[PDB]
Amino acid sequence: DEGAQWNCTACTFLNHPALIRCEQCEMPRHF
């Protein structure tokens, strides 16, 4: 129960839920 992949708000890149910043663009996850 970790969470779905999330799409970066800045670039749409679909991230692993365990990353707090976007793997592609490094923007912190948007909430």
Binding site: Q5, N7, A10, C11, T12, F13, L14, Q24, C25, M27
Partner: protein, 72 residues
Amino acid sequence: MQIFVKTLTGKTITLEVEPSDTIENVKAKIQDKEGIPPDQQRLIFAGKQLEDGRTLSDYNIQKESTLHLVLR
């Protein structure tokens, strides 16, 4: 057809493309407008990084799609 390339700083860029255009064609077009070397451009669409092999139709990229430009 037109597509848009949005950079990480907000700048939206309009490109003239064909569905049969390769990702490298698209990058060279961005170089022509913004002067960024293709080797530094990453293109993101629908959550995926686009690969130099494919065409826009491969990625099902349609008129007025927005791509995201990530510099690296």
